[PDB]
Amino acid sequence: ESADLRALAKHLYDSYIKSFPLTKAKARAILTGKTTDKSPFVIYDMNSLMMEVAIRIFQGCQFRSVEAVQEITEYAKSIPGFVNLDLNDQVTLLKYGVHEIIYTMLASLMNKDGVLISEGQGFMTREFLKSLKPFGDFMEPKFEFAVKFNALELDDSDLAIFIAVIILSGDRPGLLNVKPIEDIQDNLLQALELQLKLNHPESSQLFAKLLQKMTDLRQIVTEHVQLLQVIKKTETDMSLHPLLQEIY
Amino acid sequence: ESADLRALAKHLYDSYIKSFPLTKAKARAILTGKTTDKSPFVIYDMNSLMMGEVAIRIFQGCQFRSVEAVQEITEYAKSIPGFVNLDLNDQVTLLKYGVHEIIYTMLASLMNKDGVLISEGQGFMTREFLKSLRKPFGDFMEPKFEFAVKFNALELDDSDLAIFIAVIILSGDRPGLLNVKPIEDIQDNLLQALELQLKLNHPESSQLFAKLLQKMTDLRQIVTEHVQLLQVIKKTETDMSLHPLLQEIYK
Ligand SMILES: CCCCCCCCOc1ccc(C(=O)N[C@H](C(=O)O)C(C)C)cc1
Questions:
Q1: Cα separation, A23 vs A10, whole angstroms
Q2: CA distances from A58 to A61, A62, A217, B34 (A)
Q3: C-alpha B76 – ligand 1 centre gap (Å)
Q4: Breaks (C–N over 2.5 Å) after residues, chain A
Q5: By C-alpha distance, which of B124, B126, B158, B130 is closest to B31?
Q6: Do B213 and A208 make contact, defined as CB atoms within 8 angstroms?
Q7: Atom 7 in ligand 1: which residue has the minimum CA distance?
Q8: Which residues form the NR LBD domain (chain B)?
């Protein structure tokens, strides 16, 4: 029924809005399309940054991603059926799902020339990011993914359902009861297909093309974790990282 | 019109039968009870293999079959409407990156949880025998089996796979492509054809289209994994030759 499908899609949209402060609609109005309201502060070089450095930028993105994990966790609890799953499976779905969501939503904050930081009050250029040490290789593959992903011109109402599809994957390692997970995802996939067909009636096979993006997403995440343990061989020692590295 | 999509599906299935000598339909008839003029000889250990270095012999055997498969996939690709009209470097690029994703898709038709058909279905090599091979080589086929058991649960037949194999070839996110838009135009048409085919062939099968497309992630990971394993071999086995066609596909 278009009935419960449209009703599920509005439910998820409203919950997405409540859970994520910086929407895509708002990031775009700030980005290359600019409201004549308040320009963000631009970080293009060391002196504008001041106004290790590659390590504190790295650490700042960790702080932000820990915040996002909690925004995504509350969103997932609004997906019908998610909280009725086995508690271990809920934890497993979030553990393996959260990077994919982070890089998905980060694309909403990026264009080919940079990424919004600090709730949109800043803008760090793509060029300044490449100009770092081993840390110059972190954000480039996300910019390359973002550029191709944003070419799909999804909006928040589309991304709300797509994010739920990612969370309810079904193939995460260690799940205990796969069936209700794939049952929920089936119904989310149906809602996503109808949502794309009504929201983008002239965008042929957009559903299929969105699903193909999960390929690049999982490769991006796989690639991110390998660089993450490469720097466990640059930063290594001393103890005044107390509960800090515990929180991360 | 849906009528044009059915004709596209029929064309591709017809070329598939012509290009691939061992279909899933024949593989499943050999594997299951069915025909007993098709019963394979089973290789599960050294002496049954001796009756049909060992690890390397088996690996050169896989290499030859792989080269054979590239030739068959290449023949199939030329039948995909528009493929031969595209720029040449791109045809080559599409084949370079598509070939192994297709080989591991079609290899599932030859697999069950216990082993894999070989020598055009005359033989069956056990999954445990392949895993007991010396070190680097015991690890080649096991992720392939793991993929196949999940992929075979979709219950696709050759007419479904013909269209899916064409979707894979005509990607357009392949590294180094010159003109992406004519590629995506073909793939869009193929995706409509796949979508209609699954809805008609598997009517009671909810969201099979989405589930099948999601499987393109597992294929990408298997190739990536496989490429890492081959780097190990090139260093431990300096007296061993990869095939030129396979060398040029890998970079
Ligand atoms: C069907 C007639 C010949 C039977 C041989 C069956 C052996 C299983 O089929 C395989 C097994 C492994 C591969 C494979 O991954 N080959 C690798 C590749 O081309 O990347 C390496 C040989 C390089 C390809 C085909």
A1: 16
A2: 5, 7, 20, 61
A3: 18
A4: 51
A5: B124
A6: yes
A7: B62
A8: 4-251
- Which H or E run includes B126? strand B123-126
* End-to-end CA gap in chain A: 44
Element containing residue B144 per DSSP (H, E): helix B142-152
Short-list B114, B121, B115, B111, CA closest to B22: B121
Other CB atoms within 10 A of residue B94 CB: 22
Q: Are B174 and B140 in contact (CB under 8 A)?
A: no
DSSP character at residue B111: B
- Two tokens, residue A111: 């264009």
User: Which contacts of B152-155 are long-range, i.e. CB under 8 A and separated by 24 or more positions?
Assistant: B152/B108, B152/B109, B152/B111, B152/B112, B154/B208, B154/B211, B154/B212, B154/B215, B155/B202, B155/B205
Please tell me the number of Cα atoms within 13 Å of A18 on its side-chain side.
12
- In this structure, chain A runs to a length of 248
Taking alpha carbons only, the member of B233, B219, B221 closest to residue B60 is B233
Whether residues B214 and A211 touch (CB distance < 8 A) is answered with yes
Report yes or no: A123 and A114 within 8 Å, Cβ to Cβ.
yes
Ligand 1 nearest atom to the CA of residue B118, by list position: 4
CA distance A189 to A162: 8
Neighbours of A182 (CB within 10 A): 18
Residue B170 CA, ligand 1 centroid: distance in Å = 23
Is the CB of B246 inside a 6 Å radius of any atom of ligand 1?
Answer: yes
Query: What are phi and psi for residue A110, nearest 5 degrees?
Result: -120, 150
Q: Which of A21, A184, A208 is nearest to A97 (CA)?
A: A184
Ligand 1 centroid vs B42 CA: distance in angstroms? 18
**Domains located in chain A, CATH noted:** 1-248 (1.10.565.10)
Q: Is A66 exposed, middle or buried (0-12, 13-18, 19+ CB in 10 A)?
A: exposed
